[PDB]
Amino acid sequence: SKQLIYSGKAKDIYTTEDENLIISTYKDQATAFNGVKKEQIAGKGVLNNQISSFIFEKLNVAGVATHFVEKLSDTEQLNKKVKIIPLEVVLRNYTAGSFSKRFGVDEGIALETPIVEFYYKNDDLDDPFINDEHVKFLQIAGDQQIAYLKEETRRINELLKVWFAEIGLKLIDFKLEFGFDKDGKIILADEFSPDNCRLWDADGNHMDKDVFRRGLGELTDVYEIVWEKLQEL
């Protein structure tokens, strides 16, 4: 029992007795594209929290610095409290969704090298896509910081891509958040579940949130499958 700091779409965050620490609670809320149509869909919190807890641990073992300490419940994990960088970092391995739209090209076209993209994490501005100078202007981060957010998201792609391969899933794209820990450094934060990455079955089957949005099945099912596959590592 402690205090609710922020209330999200997928997560409520609570405090502890340790200033630097925060327990994250994964909700059953699902919400579609920016025009937030809202459905609450059972089990989702637990899968997300499992998957995220797993990958994050795997990262930590691989020496990626992150906010993960321990999965504490079905529903909760304990995280190092960081000051969030309002900059969603998207790395793309394959064309899909908004890249496809922007460039009027199909989804499934491989890239090599992979492209990163910043978006201003500002719900009111509809999380707009931005460039390096816009970030500087925004005073989120200067140079050296911009080049760090790239350089580590790529390293993160390289680990993650290999792992999903080994369980027969192609890492199409994902989306990070980073923030500052009590010591000022930058640190992978938030969560890495099927909600914030794309996952393609070797047969093009979507093992991710595109099931809720495009509407190609029931969500917990594909998530269940991904969770099942991950414990093959």
Q: Does 90 bind its own copies (CB under 8 A)?
A: no
Q: How many residues bind ligand ADP (CB under 6 A)?
A: 17
User: CB of residue 122 vs its own copies: minimum separation in angstroms?
Assistant: 8
User: CB of residue 167 vs its own copies: minimum separation in angstroms?
Assistant: 28
∠ CA(169), CA(117), CA(84), 5° rounding?
95
Q: Does 116 bind its own copies (CB under 8 A)?
A: yes
Among 25, 45, 54, 67, binds ligand ADP (CB under 6 A): 67
Which residues in the chain belong to E strands, given as ranges?
A: 4-7, 11-14, 21-26, 29-31, 38-40, 68-71, 76-80, 83-84, 87-94, 110-120, 129-130, 169-176, 178-180, 186-188, 197-201
Q: Does 129 bind Cl ion (CB under 5 A)?
A: yes
∠ CA(205), CA(97), CA(160), 5° rounding?
65
Q: Checking phi first, is residue 108 left (phi over 0); if not, alpha (psi -120 to 50) or beta? A: left
**Edge to edge, what strands does the sheet with 76-80 contain?**
4-7, 11-14, 21-26, 76-80, 68-71
Span 78-117, contacts to ligand ADP by CB under 6 A: 79-82, 84
Stretch that binds ligand ADP, among 2-10, 145-153, 163-171, 203-211 (CB under 6 A): 2-10
Would you say 10 or 160 has its CB closer to ligand ADP?
A: 10
Q: Does 134 bind its own copies (CB under 8 A)?
A: yes
Span 172-201, contacts to ligand ADP by CB under 6 A: 177, 179, 189-190
Helix axes 44-61, 219-230, angle to 10 degrees: 30
Token pair, residue 135, equals 């970030």
Contact 153, 116 (CB under 8 A): yes
Q: Does 130 bind its own copies (CB under 8 A)?
A: yes
Q: Does 9 bind ligand ADP (CB under 6 A)?
A: yes
Among 6, 103, 123, 216, binds its own copies (CB under 8 A): 103
CA dist 7 and 25 (Å) reads 10
β-strand 38-40 against 68-71: which pairing, if any?
unpaired
Chain positions contacting Cl ion, by CB under 5 A: 129
Chain positions contacting ligand ADP, by CB under 6 A: 6, 8-11, 13, 22, 67, 79-82, 84, 177, 179, 189-190
Chain positions contacting its own copies, by CB under 8 A: 102-104, 111, 115-118, 120, 122, 124-125, 128-134, 137
